[PDB]
Amino acid sequence: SDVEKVFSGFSKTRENLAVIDELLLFWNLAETDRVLDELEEALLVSDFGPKITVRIVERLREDIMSGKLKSGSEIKDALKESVLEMLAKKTELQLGFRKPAVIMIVGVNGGGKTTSLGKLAHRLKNEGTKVLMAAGDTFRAAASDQLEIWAERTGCEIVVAEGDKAKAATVLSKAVKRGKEEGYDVVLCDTSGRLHTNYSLMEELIACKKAVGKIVSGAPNEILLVLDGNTGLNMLPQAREFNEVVGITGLILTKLDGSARGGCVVSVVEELGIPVKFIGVGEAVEDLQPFDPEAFVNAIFS
Numbered sequence: 351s352d353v354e355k356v357f358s359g360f361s362k363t364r365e366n367l368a369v370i371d372e373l374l375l376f377w378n379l380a381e382t383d384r385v386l387d388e389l390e391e392a393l394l395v396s397d398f399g400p401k402i403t404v405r406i407v408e409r410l411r412e413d414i415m416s417g418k419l420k421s422g423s424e425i426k427d428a429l430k431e432s433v434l435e436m437l438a439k440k441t442e443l444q445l446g447f448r449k450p451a452v453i454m455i456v457g458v459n460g461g462g463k464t465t466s467l468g469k470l471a472h473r474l475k476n477e478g479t480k481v482l483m484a485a486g487d488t489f490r491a492a493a494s495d496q497l498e499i500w501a502e503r504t505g506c507e508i509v510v511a512e513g514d515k516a517k518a519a520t521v522l523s524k525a526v527k528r529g530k531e532e533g534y535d536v537v538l539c540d541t542s543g544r545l546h547t548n549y550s551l552m553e554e555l556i557a558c559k560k561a562v563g564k565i566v567s568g569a570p571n572e573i574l575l576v577l578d579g580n581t582g583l584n585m586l587p588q589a590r591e592f593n594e595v596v597g598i599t600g601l602i603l604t605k606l607d608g609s610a611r612g613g614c615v616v617s618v619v620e621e622l623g624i625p626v627k628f629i630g631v632g633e634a635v636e637d638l639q640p641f642d643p644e645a646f647v648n649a650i651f652s
């Protein structure tokens with residue numbers, strides 16, 4: 351079920367990568383170079399970036415020439431293993447034991463940042479976690495309102511901004527101070543949503559993590575970057591930017607339901623070394639799924 355969510359999320363990627371099975375029917379030692387040329391094309395087509403594609407393909411070539419892989423089916427399994435190792439190389443939320451844990455959620459418009467926060471709150475509440483929401487998306491009035499609805503839905507308290515021109519850092523500080531005083535397990539912090547990254551946005555995010563750190567030592571525990579999965583490889587420059595400016599601990603890739611760009615998941619993880627912790631594969635609250643690298647590899651290749 352949970353597992354079969356992901357099978358649908360990447361159904362189109364799986365259909366497209368299936369051409370690899372057909373190609374491998376015609377593999378033999380002599381045909382290795384031509385077969386690998388075609389495998390390379392298929393990976394690129396599904397948004398495996400140039401860097402990982404060459405890495406995967408050349409490792410297969412080596413292992414074929416060395417005699418480690420002696421059949422099409424062995425080659426296909428080595429392909430799956432090579433991808434799994436690029437992925438899994440922790441995807442769970444690392445909240446520790448000190449209370450409160452602090453989670454910031456960041457990302458640009460269209461990525462489902464505020465919505466994912468709501469769905470995460472719903473998930474945490476399910477496991478019996480005491481959650482305070484903090485509406486630090488001060489740029490988007492509609493986000494703050496949406497979050498209040500989410501707070502009502504999930505049964506969380508929410509700290510909201512006073513006014514249309516509140517400082518996010520101020521709202522977050524107030525939230526974490528309160529979470530600490532009132533014995534909350536987790537403070538879930540939203541942050542400002544913009545059309546695209548810019549100097550103001552990053553300055554703002556830096557100010558935010560600095561303020562929460564002032565109140566609780568080590569905060570935030572997690573800074574999760576939410577990305578529209580449909581942007582494929584075009585997400586990498588942006589994730590790279592968030593990471594070197596702010597310091598991201600986990601990715602959430604959304605809107606993935608039905609995608610043909612499954613390769614980008616592997617590409618973004620291996621390039622930046624940040625784990626994908628959740629994937630959004632639907633509009634339902636329970637369509638925010640923790641990421642399972644093995645099931646993903648099976649979903650796109652099998």
Ligand SMILES: [Mg+2]
Pocket residue numbers: 556
């Ligand atoms: Mg700094």
